[PDB]
Amino acid sequence: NLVKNKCVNFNFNGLKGTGVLTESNKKFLPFQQFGRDIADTTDAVRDPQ
Amino acid sequence: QKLIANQFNSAIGKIQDSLSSTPSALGKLQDVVNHNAQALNTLVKQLS
């Protein structure tokens, strides 16, 4: 898995989506994987690898 | 004239202090902004 700076269809963990993946500084907890915002929509994801 | 000018100047300065004070009277302007923001939030949350 990998893709940078491209509007793509991501299927992480079997969840459909489409967007641009970029670097982030969201300090996830050791167990936290996903990410969300005030708009109850996905905002971040953890690399499975 | 001098007394009236002094009174007007003092009244204007008190106006500045009244607005600069904490109890903001701009609730009429704030209600519209709050209503639009909350309406948009409900509409965007309705998708769930």
Side-chain angles (χ1 to χ4, degrees):
Chain A
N1 268 335
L2 55 89
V3 48
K4 276 170 176 58
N5 314 47
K6 302 282 185 288
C7 195
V8 297
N9 38 358
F10 64 92
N11 193 51
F12 274 155
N13 305 340
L15 279 165
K16 299 288 316 176
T18 304
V20 171
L21 279 166
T22 179
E23 58 94 29
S24 73
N25 218 0
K26 299 316 192 52
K27 295 91 44 184
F28 292 171
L29 287 181
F31 70 102
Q32 283 174 344
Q33 304 297 120
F34 293 147
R36 275 249 202 260
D37 47 6
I38 323 178
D40 53 271
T41 40
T42 309
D43 202 10
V45 72
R46 274 255 202 190
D47 207 353
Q49 303 175 3
Chain B
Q1 190 176 339
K2 168 61 63 178
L3 172 73
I4 285 162
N6 283 358
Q7 292 186 226
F8 170 80
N9 289 347
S10 76
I12 284 285
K14 160 72 188 40
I15 294 296
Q16 270 190 170
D17 179 32
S18 173
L19 274 305
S20 79
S21 178
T22 304
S24 61
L26 56 88
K28 291 182 67 44
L29 307 187
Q30 193 71 226
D31 71 15
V32 159
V33 182
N34 287 341
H35 280 199
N36 295 333
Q38 164 182 79
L40 265 183
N41 205 47
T42 81
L43 183 75
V44 173
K45 189 256 293 178
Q46 271 278 287
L47 275 183
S48 296

Coordinates of all heavy atoms in Angstrom, one line a residue:
Chain A
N1 N 0.8 -1.2 0.0 CA 0.0 0.0 0.0 C 0.8 1.3 0.0 O 1.8 1.4 0.7 CB -0.9 0.1 1.3 CG -2.2 -0.5 1.1 OD1 -2.7 -0.6 0.0 ND2 -2.8 -0.9 2.2
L2 N 0.4 2.3 -0.8 CA 1.0 3.6 -0.9 C 0.4 4.4 -2.0 O -0.1 3.9 -3.0 CB 2.5 3.4 -1.2 CG 2.9 2.6 -2.4 CD1 3.0 3.4 -3.7 CD2 4.2 1.9 -2.1
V3 N 0.4 5.7 -1.8 CA -0.2 6.7 -2.8 C -0.1 8.1 -2.2 O -0.5 8.3 -1.1 CB -1.6 6.4 -3.2 CG1 -2.5 6.1 -1.9 CG2 -2.2 7.5 -4.0
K4 N 0.5 9.0 -2.9 CA 0.7 10.4 -2.4 C 0.2 11.4 -3.4 O 0.3 11.2 -4.6 CB 2.1 10.7 -2.0 CG 2.6 10.2 -0.7 CD 4.1 10.3 -0.5 CE 4.5 9.8 0.9 NZ 4.0 8.5 1.2
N5 N -0.4 12.5 -2.8 CA -0.8 13.6 -3.6 C -1.8 13.3 -4.7 O -1.8 13.9 -5.8 CB 0.4 14.4 -4.2 CG 1.5 14.6 -3.2 OD1 1.8 13.7 -2.4 ND2 1.9 15.8 -3.1
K6 N -2.6 12.2 -4.6 CA -3.5 11.9 -5.6 C -5.0 11.6 -5.2 O -5.2 10.8 -4.2 CB -3.0 10.7 -6.4 CG -1.6 10.9 -7.0 CD -1.7 11.7 -8.3 CE -0.4 11.8 -9.0 NZ 0.5 12.7 -8.2
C7 N -5.9 12.2 -5.8 CA -7.3 11.9 -5.6 C -7.6 10.5 -6.1 O -7.6 10.2 -7.3 CB -8.2 12.9 -6.4 SG -9.9 12.9 -6.0
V8 N -7.7 9.5 -5.1 CA -7.8 8.1 -5.5 C -9.0 7.5 -4.7 O -9.4 8.0 -3.7 CB -6.5 7.4 -5.2 CG1 -5.4 7.9 -6.1 CG2 -6.1 7.5 -3.7
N9 N -9.4 6.3 -5.1 CA -10.3 5.5 -4.4 C -9.6 4.6 -3.4 O -9.0 3.6 -3.8 CB -11.2 4.7 -5.3 CG -10.3 4.1 -6.5 OD1 -9.1 4.4 -6.6 ND2 -10.9 3.3 -7.4
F10 N -9.6 5.0 -2.1 CA -8.9 4.2 -1.1 C -9.9 3.2 -0.5 O -11.1 3.5 -0.3 CB -8.4 5.1 0.0 CG -9.4 5.9 0.8 CD1 -10.0 5.3 1.9 CD2 -9.8 7.1 0.4 CE1 -10.9 6.0 2.7 CE2 -10.8 7.8 1.1 CZ -11.3 7.3 2.2
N11 N -9.5 2.0 -0.3 CA -10.3 0.9 0.3 C -9.7 0.4 1.5 O -9.6 -0.9 1.7 CB -10.5 -0.2 -0.8 CG -11.7 -1.1 -0.4 OD1 -12.8 -0.7 0.0 ND2 -11.4 -2.4 -0.4
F12 N -9.2 1.2 2.4 CA -8.5 0.7 3.6 C -9.5 0.0 4.5 O -10.6 0.5 4.8 CB -7.9 1.9 4.4 CG -6.5 2.3 3.9 CD1 -6.1 3.6 4.1 CD2 -5.7 1.4 3.3 CE1 -4.8 3.9 3.7 CE2 -4.4 1.7 2.9 CZ -4.0 3.0 3.1
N13 N -9.1 -1.2 4.9 CA -9.9 -2.0 5.8 C -11.3 -2.3 5.2 O -12.2 -2.6 6.0 CB -10.0 -1.4 7.2 CG -8.7 -1.1 7.8 OD1 -7.6 -1.7 7.4 ND2 -8.6 -0.2 8.8
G14 N -11.4 -2.3 3.9 CA -12.6 -2.5 3.2 C -13.6 -1.4 3.2 O -14.7 -1.5 2.8
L15 N -13.2 -0.2 3.6 CA -14.1 1.0 3.6 C -13.8 1.8 2.3 O -12.7 2.2 2.1 CB -13.9 1.9 4.8 CG -14.5 1.4 6.1 CD1 -14.0 2.1 7.3 CD2 -16.0 1.6 6.0
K16 N -14.9 2.1 1.6 CA -14.8 2.9 0.4 C -14.6 4.3 0.7 O -15.0 4.9 1.7 CB -16.1 2.7 -0.4 CG -16.4 1.2 -0.9 CD -15.4 0.8 -2.0 CE -15.3 1.9 -3.0 NZ -14.2 1.5 -4.1
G17 N -13.9 5.0 -0.2 CA -13.6 6.4 -0.1 C -12.9 6.9 -1.3 O -12.4 6.1 -2.1
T18 N -12.9 8.2 -1.5 CA -12.2 8.9 -2.6 C -11.6 10.2 -2.1 O -12.4 11.1 -1.6 CB -13.1 9.0 -3.8 OG1 -13.6 7.8 -4.1 CG2 -12.3 9.6 -4.9
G19 N -10.3 10.4 -2.2 CA -9.7 11.7 -1.8 C -8.2 11.7 -2.1 O -7.6 10.8 -2.7
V20 N -7.6 12.8 -1.5 CA -6.2 13.0 -1.6 C -5.5 12.7 -0.3 O -5.9 13.2 0.8 CB -5.9 14.5 -2.0 CG1 -4.4 14.8 -1.9 CG2 -6.4 14.7 -3.4
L21 N -4.5 11.8 -0.3 CA -3.8 11.4 0.9 C -2.5 12.3 1.0 O -1.8 12.4 0.1 CB -3.5 9.9 0.9 CG -4.6 9.0 1.2 CD1 -4.3 7.6 0.9 CD2 -4.9 9.1 2.7
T22 N -2.3 12.8 2.2 CA -1.2 13.7 2.5 C -0.7 13.4 3.9 O -1.4 12.8 4.7 CB -1.5 15.2 2.3 OG1 -0.4 16.0 2.6 CG2 -2.7 15.6 3.3
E23 N 0.5 13.9 4.2 CA 1.0 13.7 5.6 C 0.2 14.5 6.6 O -0.3 15.6 6.3 CB 2.5 14.2 5.6 CG 2.7 15.6 5.1 CD 2.8 16.6 6.3 OE1 3.2 16.1 7.4 OE2 2.4 17.7 6.1
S24 N 0.2 14.0 7.8 CA -0.6 14.6 8.9 C 0.2 14.5 10.2 O 1.2 13.7 10.3 CB -1.9 14.0 9.1 OG -1.8 12.7 9.6
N25 N -0.1 15.3 11.2 CA 0.5 15.4 12.5 C -0.5 15.0 13.6 O -0.3 15.5 14.7 CB 1.1 16.7 12.7 CG 2.5 16.6 13.4 OD1 2.9 15.5 13.8 ND2 3.1 17.7 13.7
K26 N -1.5 14.2 13.3 CA -2.5 13.8 14.2 C -1.9 12.8 15.2 O -1.7 11.6 14.8 CB -3.7 13.3 13.5 CG -4.4 14.2 12.6 CD -4.6 15.6 13.3 CE -5.5 16.5 12.5 NZ -6.8 15.8 12.2
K27 N -1.6 13.2 16.4 CA -0.9 12.3 17.3 C -1.8 11.2 17.8 O -2.5 11.4 18.9 CB -0.3 13.1 18.5 CG 0.8 14.1 18.1 CD 0.2 15.5 17.8 CE -0.8 15.9 18.8 NZ -1.4 17.2 18.5
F28 N -2.0 10.2 17.1 CA -2.8 9.0 17.4 C -2.2 8.3 18.6 O -1.0 8.2 18.9 CB -2.9 8.1 16.3 CG -3.7 8.6 15.1 CD1 -3.8 7.9 13.9 CD2 -4.4 9.7 15.2 CE1 -4.5 8.3 12.9 CE2 -5.2 10.2 14.2 CZ -5.2 9.5 13.0
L29 N -3.1 7.7 19.4 CA -2.7 6.8 20.5 C -2.2 5.5 19.9 O -2.5 5.2 18.7 CB -3.9 6.5 21.4 CG -4.2 7.7 22.3 CD1 -5.4 7.4 23.2 CD2 -3.0 8.1 23.1
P30 N -1.4 4.7 20.6 CA -0.9 3.5 20.1 C -1.9 2.6 19.5 O -1.6 1.9 18.5 CB -0.2 2.8 21.3 CG 0.0 3.9 22.3 CD -0.8 5.1 21.9
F31 N -3.1 2.5 20.0 CA -4.1 1.7 19.5 C -5.0 2.4 18.5 O -5.7 1.7 17.6 CB -5.0 1.1 20.6 CG -5.9 2.2 21.2 CD1 -7.2 2.3 20.9 CD2 -5.4 3.1 22.1 CE1 -8.0 3.2 21.5 CE2 -6.2 4.1 22.7 CZ -7.5 4.1 22.4
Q32 N -5.1 3.7 18.5 CA -6.0 4.4 17.5 C -5.5 4.2 16.1 O -4.3 4.2 15.8 CB -6.0 5.9 17.9 CG -6.8 6.2 19.1 CD -6.7 7.7 19.4 OE1 -5.8 8.4 19.0 NE2 -7.6 8.2 20.2
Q33 N -6.5 4.0 15.2 CA -6.2 3.7 13.8 C -6.9 4.7 12.9 O -6.2 5.3 12.0 CB -6.8 2.3 13.4 CG -6.2 1.2 14.3 CD -4.7 1.1 14.1 OE1 -3.9 1.2 15.1 NE2 -4.2 0.8 12.9
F34 N -8.1 5.0 13.0 CA -8.9 5.9 12.1 C -8.8 7.3 12.5 O -8.0 7.7 13.4 CB -10.3 5.4 12.0 CG -10.5 4.0 11.4 CD1 -11.5 3.2 11.8 CD2 -9.6 3.6 10.4 CE1 -11.7 2.0 11.2 CE2 -9.8 2.4 9.8 CZ -10.8 1.6 10.2
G35 N -9.6 8.2 11.9 CA -9.7 9.6 12.3 C -11.0 10.1 11.8 O -11.6 9.7 10.7
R36 N -11.5 11.1 12.5 CA -12.8 11.7 12.2 C -12.8 13.2 12.6 O -11.9 13.6 13.3 CB -14.0 11.0 12.9 CG -14.5 9.8 12.2 CD -15.9 10.1 11.7 NE -16.7 8.8 11.5 CZ -16.8 8.2 10.4 NH1 -16.3 8.7 9.2 NH2 -17.5 7.0 10.3
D37 N -13.7 14.0 12.1 CA -13.8 15.4 12.4 C -15.2 15.7 12.9 O -16.0 14.9 13.2 CB -13.5 16.2 11.2 CG -14.2 15.8 9.9 OD1 -15.1 14.9 10.1 OD2 -14.0 16.3 8.9
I38 N -15.5 17.1 13.1 CA -16.7 17.5 13.6 C -17.9 17.2 12.6 O -19.0 17.1 13.1 CB -16.7 19.1 13.8 CG1 -15.3 19.4 14.4 CG2 -17.8 19.5 14.8 CD1 -15.1 20.9 14.6
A39 N -17.6 16.9 11.4 CA -18.5 16.6 10.4 C -18.9 15.1 10.3 O -19.4 14.6 9.3 CB -18.1 17.1 9.0
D40 N -18.6 14.4 11.4 CA -18.8 13.0 11.5 C -18.5 12.2 10.2 O -19.2 11.3 9.8 CB -20.3 12.7 11.9 CG -21.3 13.3 10.9 OD1 -21.7 14.5 11.2 OD2 -21.7 12.7 9.9
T41 N -17.3 12.6 9.7 CA -16.8 11.9 8.5 C -15.3 11.6 8.7 O -14.7 12.2 9.6 CB -16.9 12.8 7.2 OG1 -16.6 14.2 7.6 CG2 -18.3 12.7 6.7
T42 N -14.8 10.7 7.9 CA -13.4 10.2 8.1 C -12.5 11.4 7.8 O -12.7 12.2 6.9 CB -13.1 9.0 7.2 OG1 -14.1 8.0 7.4 CG2 -11.7 8.5 7.6
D43 N -11.4 11.5 8.6 CA -10.4 12.5 8.4 C -9.0 12.0 8.5 O -8.1 12.7 7.9 CB -10.5 13.6 9.5 CG -9.9 14.9 9.1 OD1 -9.5 15.1 8.0 OD2 -9.8 15.8 10.0
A44 N -8.7 10.8 9.0 CA -7.4 10.3 9.1 C -7.4 8.8 9.1 O -8.5 8.2 9.4 CB -6.6 10.8 10.3
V45 N -6.3 8.1 8.8 CA -6.2 6.7 8.8 C -4.7 6.3 9.1 O -3.8 7.1 8.8 CB -6.6 6.1 7.4 CG1 -5.6 6.5 6.3 CG2 -6.9 4.6 7.5
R46 N -4.5 5.1 9.7 CA -3.2 4.7 10.0 C -2.7 3.7 9.0 O -3.5 2.8 8.5 CB -3.2 4.0 11.4 CG -3.0 4.9 12.6 CD -1.7 4.8 13.2 NE -1.7 5.2 14.6 CZ -0.6 5.4 15.3 NH1 0.6 5.2 14.8 NH2 -0.7 5.8 16.6
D47 N -1.4 3.7 8.7 CA -0.8 2.8 7.7 C -0.9 1.4 8.2 O -0.4 1.2 9.4 CB 0.6 3.2 7.4 CG 1.0 2.9 6.0 OD1 0.3 2.2 5.3 OD2 2.2 3.3 5.6
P48 N -1.4 0.5 7.5 CA -1.5 -0.9 8.0 C -0.1 -1.5 8.2 O 0.1 -2.4 9.0 CB -2.3 -1.7 7.0 CG -3.0 -0.6 6.2 CD -2.1 0.6 6.2
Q49 N 0.9 -1.0 7.5 CA 2.2 -1.5 7.5 C 3.2 -0.7 8.4 O 3.8 -1.2 9.3 CB 2.8 -1.5 6.1 CG 2.0 -2.3 5.1 CD 2.5 -2.2 3.7 OE1 3.5 -1.5 3.5 NE2 1.8 -2.7 2.7
Chain B
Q1 N -22.6 77.1 23.7 CA -22.0 76.2 22.7 C -20.9 75.4 23.3 O -20.7 74.2 23.0 CB -21.4 77.1 21.5 CG -20.9 76.2 20.4 CD -20.4 77.1 19.2 OE1 -20.8 78.3 19.1 NE2 -19.6 76.5 18.4
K2 N -20.1 76.0 24.2 CA -19.0 75.3 24.8 C -19.5 74.2 25.7 O -19.0 73.0 25.6 CB -18.1 76.3 25.7 CG -17.1 75.6 26.6 CD -16.1 74.8 25.8 CE -15.3 75.6 24.9 NZ -14.3 74.9 24.2
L3 N -20.5 74.4 26.5 CA -21.1 73.4 27.3 C -21.7 72.3 26.5 O -21.6 71.1 26.8 CB -22.2 74.0 28.2 CG -23.1 73.1 29.0 CD1 -22.3 72.5 30.2 CD2 -24.3 73.9 29.5
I4 N -22.4 72.6 25.4 CA -23.0 71.6 24.5 C -21.9 70.7 23.9 O -22.0 69.5 23.8 CB -23.9 72.2 23.5 CG1 -25.2 72.6 24.1 CG2 -24.2 71.2 22.4 CD1 -26.0 73.6 23.3
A5 N -20.8 71.4 23.4 CA -19.7 70.6 22.9 C -19.1 69.7 23.9 O -18.8 68.5 23.6 CB -18.7 71.6 22.3
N6 N -18.9 70.2 25.1 CA -18.4 69.3 26.2 C -19.3 68.1 26.4 O -18.8 67.0 26.6 CB -18.1 70.2 27.4 CG -16.9 71.0 27.3 OD1 -16.2 71.0 26.3 ND2 -16.6 71.8 28.4
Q7 N -20.6 68.4 26.5 CA -21.5 67.3 26.8 C -21.5 66.3 25.6 O -21.6 65.1 25.9 CB -22.9 67.9 26.9 CG -23.1 68.7 28.2 CD -24.6 69.2 28.3 OE1 -24.9 70.3 28.6 NE2 -25.5 68.2 28.2
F8 N -21.5 66.8 24.4 CA -21.4 65.9 23.2 C -20.2 65.0 23.3 O -20.2 63.8 23.0 CB -21.5 66.7 21.9 CG -21.3 65.8 20.7 CD1 -22.2 65.0 20.2 CD2 -20.0 65.9 20.1 CE1 -22.0 64.3 19.1 CE2 -19.8 65.1 19.0 CZ -20.7 64.3 18.5
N9 N -19.0 65.7 23.6 CA -17.8 64.9 23.6 C -17.8 63.9 24.7 O -17.4 62.7 24.5 CB -16.6 65.9 23.8 CG -16.3 66.7 22.6 OD1 -16.8 66.5 21.5 ND2 -15.5 67.8 22.8
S10 N -18.3 64.2 25.9 CA -18.4 63.2 27.0 C -19.4 62.1 26.6 O -19.1 60.9 26.9 CB -18.9 63.9 28.2 OG -20.3 64.2 28.2
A11 N -20.5 62.4 25.9 CA -21.5 61.4 25.5 C -20.8 60.5 24.5 O -21.0 59.2 24.6 CB -22.7 62.1 25.0
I12 N -20.1 61.0 23.6 CA -19.4 60.1 22.6 C -18.4 59.2 23.3 O -18.3 58.0 23.0 CB -18.8 61.0 21.5 CG1 -19.8 61.5 20.5 CG2 -17.7 60.2 20.8 CD1 -20.3 60.4 19.6
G13 N -17.6 59.8 24.2 CA -16.6 59.0 24.9 C -17.3 57.9 25.7 O -16.9 56.7 25.8
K14 N -18.5 58.2 26.3 CA -19.2 57.2 27.0 C -19.7 56.1 26.1 O -19.9 55.0 26.5 CB -20.3 57.8 27.9 CG -21.4 56.8 28.3 CD -20.9 55.9 29.4 CE -21.9 54.8 29.7 NZ -22.5 54.3 28.5
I15 N -20.0 56.5 24.8 CA -20.5 55.5 23.9 C -19.4 54.5 23.6 O -19.6 53.3 23.5 CB -21.0 56.2 22.6 CG1 -22.2 57.1 22.9 CG2 -21.3 55.2 21.5 CD1 -23.4 56.3 23.4
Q16 N -18.2 55.1 23.5 CA -17.0 54.2 23.2 C -16.8 53.2 24.3 O -16.6 52.0 24.1 CB -15.8 55.1 23.0 CG -15.5 55.5 21.5 CD -14.2 56.1 21.3 OE1 -13.7 56.3 20.2 NE2 -13.5 56.4 22.4
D17 N -16.9 53.7 25.6 CA -16.8 52.9 26.7 C -17.9 51.8 26.8 O -17.7 50.7 27.1 CB -16.7 53.7 28.0 CG -16.6 52.8 29.3 OD1 -16.0 51.8 29.2 OD2 -17.1 53.3 30.3
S18 N -19.1 52.2 26.5 CA -20.3 51.3 26.5 C -20.1 50.2 25.5 O -20.4 49.0 25.8 CB -21.5 52.1 26.2 OG -22.6 51.2 26.1
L19 N -19.6 50.5 24.3 CA -19.4 49.4 23.3 C -18.2 48.6 23.7 O -18.3 47.4 23.6 CB -19.3 50.0 21.9 CG -20.6 50.3 21.2 CD1 -21.4 49.0 21.2 CD2 -21.4 51.4 21.8
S20 N -17.1 49.2 24.2 CA -15.9 48.5 24.5 C -16.1 47.6 25.7 O -15.2 46.8 26.0 CB -14.8 49.5 24.8 OG -14.9 50.1 26.0
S21 N -17.2 47.8 26.5 CA -17.5 47.0 27.7 C -17.9 45.6 27.3 O -18.2 45.3 26.1 CB -18.6 47.7 28.5 OG -19.0 47.0 29.6
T22 N -17.8 44.7 28.2 CA -18.1 43.3 28.0 C -19.6 43.0 27.6 O -19.8 42.3 26.6 CB -17.8 42.5 29.3 OG1 -16.4 42.7 29.6 CG2 -18.0 41.0 29.0
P23 N -20.6 43.6 28.2 CA -22.0 43.2 27.8 C -22.3 43.6 26.4 O -23.0 44.6 26.2 CB -22.9 43.8 28.9 CG -22.0 44.5 29.8 CD -20.6 44.5 29.4
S24 N -21.9 42.8 25.5 CA -22.1 43.1 24.0 C -23.6 43.1 23.7 O -24.3 42.2 24.1 CB -21.4 42.1 23.2 OG -21.9 40.8 23.4
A25 N -24.0 44.2 23.1 CA -25.4 44.4 22.7 C -25.7 43.9 21.3 O -26.8 44.0 20.8 CB -25.8 45.9 22.8
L26 N -24.7 43.3 20.6 CA -24.9 42.9 19.3 C -25.5 41.5 19.2 O -25.1 40.6 18.4 CB -23.6 43.0 18.5 CG -22.3 42.2 19.1 CD1 -22.2 40.8 18.6 CD2 -21.1 43.0 18.8
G27 N -26.6 41.3 19.9 CA -27.3 40.0 19.9 C -28.1 39.9 18.7 O -28.3 38.8 18.2
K28 N -28.6 41.0 18.1 CA -29.4 40.9 16.9 C -28.5 40.4 15.8 O -29.0 39.6 15.0 CB -30.0 42.3 16.5 CG -31.0 42.7 17.5 CD -31.6 44.1 17.1 CE -32.4 43.9 15.8 NZ -33.3 42.7 15.8
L29 N -27.3 40.9 15.6 CA -26.4 40.4 14.6 C -25.9 39.0 14.9 O -25.7 38.2 14.0 CB -25.2 41.3 14.5 CG -25.5 42.8 14.2 CD1 -24.3 43.6 13.9 CD2 -26.5 42.9 13.1
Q30 N -25.7 38.7 16.2 CA -25.3 37.3 16.6 C -26.3 36.2 16.3 O -26.0 35.1 16.0 CB -24.8 37.3 18.0 CG -24.0 36.0 18.3 CD -22.6 36.0 17.7 OE1 -22.2 35.0 17.1 NE2 -21.9 37.2 17.7
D31 N -27.6 36.6 16.5 CA -28.6 35.5 16.4 C -28.7 35.0 15.0 O -28.8 33.8 14.8 CB -30.0 36.1 16.8 CG -30.6 37.1 15.9 OD1 -30.1 37.3 14.7 OD2 -31.5 37.8 16.3
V32 N -28.6 35.9 14.0 CA -28.6 35.4 12.6 C -27.4 34.5 12.2 O -27.6 33.5 11.6 CB -28.6 36.7 11.6 CG1 -28.2 36.3 10.2 CG2 -30.0 37.2 11.6
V33 N -26.2 34.9 12.7 CA -25.1 34.1 12.4 C -25.2 32.7 13.1 O -24.9 31.7 12.5 CB -23.8 34.8 12.9 CG1 -22.6 34.0 12.6 CG2 -23.7 36.2 12.3
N34 N -25.7 32.7 14.4 CA -25.8 31.5 15.1 C -26.9 30.6 14.4 O -26.7 29.4 14.3 CB -26.2 31.8 16.5 CG -25.1 32.3 17.3 OD1 -23.9 32.2 17.0 ND2 -25.4 33.0 18.5
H35 N -28.0 31.2 14.0 CA -29.0 30.5 13.3 C -28.6 29.8 12.0 O -28.8 28.7 11.7 CB -30.2 31.4 13.0 CG -31.1 31.6 14.2 ND1 -32.4 32.0 14.1 CD2 -30.9 31.5 15.5 CE1 -32.9 32.2 15.3 NE2 -32.0 31.8 16.2
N36 N -27.8 30.6 11.2 CA -27.3 30.1 9.9 C -26.3 29.0 10.2 O -26.4 27.9 9.5 CB -26.7 31.2 9.1 CG -27.7 32.2 8.6 OD1 -28.9 31.9 8.5 ND2 -27.3 33.4 8.4
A37 N -25.4 29.2 11.1 CA -24.4 28.1 11.4 C -25.1 26.9 11.9 O -24.7 25.8 11.5 CB -23.4 28.7 12.4
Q38 N -26.0 27.0 12.8 CA -26.7 25.8 13.4 C -27.6 25.1 12.4 O -27.6 23.9 12.3 CB -27.5 26.2 14.6 CG -28.5 25.2 15.1 CD -29.3 25.7 16.3 OE1 -30.2 26.5 16.1 NE2 -28.9 25.2 17.5
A39 N -28.2 25.9 11.5 CA -29.0 25.3 10.4 C -28.1 24.5 9.5 O -28.4 23.3 9.1 CB -29.8 26.3 9.7
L40 N -27.0 25.0 9.1 CA -26.0 24.3 8.3 C -25.5 23.1 9.0 O -25.3 22.0 8.3 CB -24.9 25.2 7.9 CG -25.1 25.9 6.5 CD1 -23.8 26.7 6.2 CD2 -25.3 24.9 5.4
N41 N -25.2 23.2 10.3 CA -24.7 22.0 11.0 C -25.8 20.9 11.0 O -25.4 19.7 10.8 CB -24.3 22.4 12.4 CG -23.3 21.4 13.0 OD1 -22.3 21.1 12.4 ND2 -23.5 21.0 14.2
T42 N -27.0 21.2 11.3 CA -28.1 20.2 11.3 C -28.2 19.6 9.9 O -28.4 18.4 9.7 CB -29.4 20.8 11.7 OG1 -30.1 21.5 10.7 CG2 -29.3 21.6 13.0
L43 N -28.2 20.4 8.8 CA -28.3 19.9 7.5 C -27.2 19.0 7.1 O -27.4 17.9 6.5 CB -28.4 21.1 6.5 CG -28.6 20.7 5.0 CD1 -30.1 20.2 4.8 CD2 -28.3 21.8 4.1
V44 N -26.0 19.3 7.5 CA -24.8 18.5 7.1 C -24.8 17.2 8.0 O -24.4 16.1 7.5 CB -23.5 19.3 7.3 CG1 -22.3 18.4 7.1 CG2 -23.5 20.4 6.3
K45 N -25.3 17.3 9.2 CA -25.4 16.1 10.1 C -26.6 15.2 9.7 O -26.5 14.0 10.0 CB -25.5 16.5 11.5 CG -25.4 15.4 12.5 CD -26.8 15.0 13.1 CE -27.3 16.2 13.9 NZ -28.7 15.8 14.4
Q46 N -27.6 15.7 9.0 CA -28.7 15.0 8.5 C -28.3 13.8 7.6 O -29.1 12.9 7.4 CB -29.8 15.9 7.9 CG -30.8 16.4 8.9 CD -31.9 15.5 9.2 OE1 -32.8 15.2 8.4 NE2 -31.8 14.9 10.4
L47 N -27.1 13.9 7.0 CA -26.7 12.9 6.0 C -26.5 11.6 6.7 O -26.5 10.5 6.1 CB -25.5 13.3 5.3 CG -25.7 14.2 4.1 CD1 -24.3 14.5 3.4 CD2 -26.6 13.6 3.1
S48 N -26.3 11.6 8.0 CA -26.0 10.3 8.8 C -27.3 9.7 9.2 O -27.3 8.6 9.7 CB -25.2 10.6 10.0 OG -23.9 11.1 9.7

